[PDB]
Ligand binder design. Structure first.
Ligand SMILES: [Fe+3]
Lengths: 421, 419
């Protein structure tokens, strides 16, 4: 019997995942403390096998379940899965170029306000659609836009604001919101690293017109490769979907003959950025643990910050943005310049001690080699942005790290700083 | 033991597949004859479970195997998997905008010669990179570019030729190459529908600088969603890869000893797949030779039998000196037949016979082309004819001679040839 063969395959899988996905006890000196990672188990492997058995391959049963459950978690009616966080950002900004949006459709030459201290694909979509990025400085130790600088970047060409809640910490949604409204600007919330974060009690990604998230292994939940675009607007949802699906027409011009297959009628300049149900299944399992993961990240963050307070004379510790409850992606630290050493020294020392580190992504996008010939504007100076590029880095606090993992990390900072003496 | 649980699961799925993925017998009037489809079995489901079990998720073990085996099948050293045929086309054209190609790099305002009778994503990447598409007419009944018209579309802004081997039939490679070489133009072969096709005995996709293929279900092999970009140039491979991977390197004013993993040499996307997708495709690769021969067989059989309707419809013809791996069976309804394409398509639909039009028909007439900037050299006569009178039906591995026999009888019935 079929339904029988499945339940019995689920068993052999649920028992394989017991050996395979079993966490190993921490062993100082030998065990590593990566900066991020995935935490999967029996459920993940079970659903993926189910999806495999289905033999459907393209999105369906599991993808429907996933989009629905994530929509309920975020509290939004429209969720569309795509190939990655980057693809999500690309689809978000590109959808706003749709001629169906009339006078407020983004056009080549228009401007989009953002920050230079972020991830490349948060800004690439703007440049890839012919628009112009306008940068303003960020704040330390929140590592998010200094919202007070946004207003001065606005001009006649300003058209939207696309920014990411860096490392799960939220950006001043009150000031960004205020500016967007006053000038009727579109707001795209890049929540690729902030799934679960909240501001003023409201879930991140539900303040703007469109929100994006990533499911790469680093992140709160994974599908291996995957991401999602979400919104509260039916119109935008239909536009996004069209751009993701070959640009073919939907919801419900040119000179095609009457009775031309609708399946082959294209209303947008489109890609094909869909995923498989195998990917969707993994993410569905992961969704069951999200609340658990968000809680643990907040726990590890506090524990690590309290314990690392002993080095406060040499490093600046991270601070959540006022009136927010971030779902931390990582733990951002800035080495003080008058400490006597370079970030290279600390990073390398930690590396030898098995403690993983990551710099704050691009550091300063404008200084990245690929920005050599890009057309952009910067309002004010990127002082803090350059400091981040030179002095900042982050370490792990993800669900896979226990108190023993963190205790080891704290002792290494102490050792490196001679505070154990 | 873990090695046991695996082999034990392999068996349980091996018998699950024999029941689920079992081809049911054809039944005139009940069974459908779709235009395309996938043929998967035990191997596919087995590897996908293996990959699921690995728990690696991102590309790895199976993807390495897939890119390797496919590179061996095509006869190229570099194969890079991506999310879809469309993403592959996007990466192929975009990669040629890399400043590392120097004076050879594609710039906004430059032109790319192609045809309007095709799939949107074959041309969109040109428009998305700021370039200008230049169209020329196609030929009937090969449904591929009328190569003789290409030379006249060449101007001082021309930099590349990107066209697909429509429905598996090959385009005049001898002429395209001649023109490409004479003007030092880049050549991108869109083989999304031509995996296995050959021209002058050489595998399609190995004549140009970059080749692309799709793994969507309707296609020669599938991963559910997936595609690949391939080439013989190590330089391009590195560029393609960078654009696919956040645009990271491997200039600017970054501090010394800045993490190379966070140094970005291109304006990038993230168009990678999972090893679950790669596994499925790896299984599929074990059947490609079988699928290519069956499609060629179904094609011959269908064309021969359908010869009885030659007074009303124009039958497909392989391009001279080629051996196409047919994706579908393209047919053009003659205008003086007294009926319209809608009539035949609807009749066929009612009889459970699937049909598809030739994709965009004429891209320049598609609504999204309303304000696009492009040039057309000559007239798109045949292109417009295709948009109005052409359509295709299935000949994929899932179709048996009984499936085809039924299709032929319905065409005859339609035209009153059975009387
Ligand atoms: Fe439709």
């Amino acid at each position: 019997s079929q339904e029988e063969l499945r339940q019995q395959i689920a068993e052999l899988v649920a028992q394989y995942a017991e050996t395979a996905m079993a966490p190993k006890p921490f062993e100082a000196g030998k065990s590593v403390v990566p900066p991020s990672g995935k935490v999967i188990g029996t459920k993940e492997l079970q659903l993926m096998v189910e999806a495999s058995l289905d033999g459907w391959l393209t999105t369906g049963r599991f993808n429907d379940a996933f989009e629905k459950k994530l929509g309920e978690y975020l509290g939004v009616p429209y969720v569309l899965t795509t190939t990655s966080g980057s693809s999500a950002n690309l689809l978000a900004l590109t959808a706003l170029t749709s001629p169906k949006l009339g006078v407020r459709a983004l056009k080549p030459g228009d401007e989009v306000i953002t920050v230079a201290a972020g991830f490349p694909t948060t800004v690439n979509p703007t440049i890839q659609n012919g628009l112009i990025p306008v940068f303003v400085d960020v704040d330390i130790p929140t590592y998010n836009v200094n919202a007070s600088l946004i207003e001065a970047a606005v001009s006649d060409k300003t058209k939207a604001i696309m920014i990411a809640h860096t490392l799960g910490n939220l950006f001043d949604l009150a000031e960004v919101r205020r500016v967007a409204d006053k000038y009727n600007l579109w707001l795209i919330e890049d929540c690729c690293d902030a799934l679960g974060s909240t501001y003023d009690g409201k879930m991140a990604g539900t303040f703007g017109d469109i929100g994006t998230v990533s499911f790469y292994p680093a992140h709160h939940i994974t599908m291996g490769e995957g991401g999602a675009v979400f919104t509260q607007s039916a119109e935008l949802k239909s536009i996004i979907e069209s751009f993701r699906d070959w640009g073919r027409d939907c919801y419900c011009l040119g000179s095609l003959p009457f009775g031309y297959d609708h399946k082959y009628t294209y209303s947008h300049l489109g890609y094909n950025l869909k995923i498989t149900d195998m990917q969707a299944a993994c993410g569905l399992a992961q969704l069951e643990r999200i609340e658990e993961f968000v809680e643990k990240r907040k726990a590890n963050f506090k524990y690590l910050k309290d314990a690392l307070q002993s080095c406060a004379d040499f490093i600046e510790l991270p601070e959540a943005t006022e009136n927010s409850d971030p779902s931390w992606f990582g733990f951002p630290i800035t080495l003080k310049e008058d400490s006597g050493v370079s970030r290279i020294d600390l990073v390398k020392f930690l590396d030898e001690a098995k403690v993983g580190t990551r710099l704050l992504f691009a550091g300063n996008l404008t200084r990245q080699p690929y920005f050599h010939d890009v057309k952009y504007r910067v309002v004010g100076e990127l002082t803090n942005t350059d400091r981040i590029m030179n002095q900042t880095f982050w370490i792990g606090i993800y669900p896979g790290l226990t108190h023993d993992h963190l205790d080891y990390v704290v002792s290494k900072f102490e050792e490196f700083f001679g505070l154990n003496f």
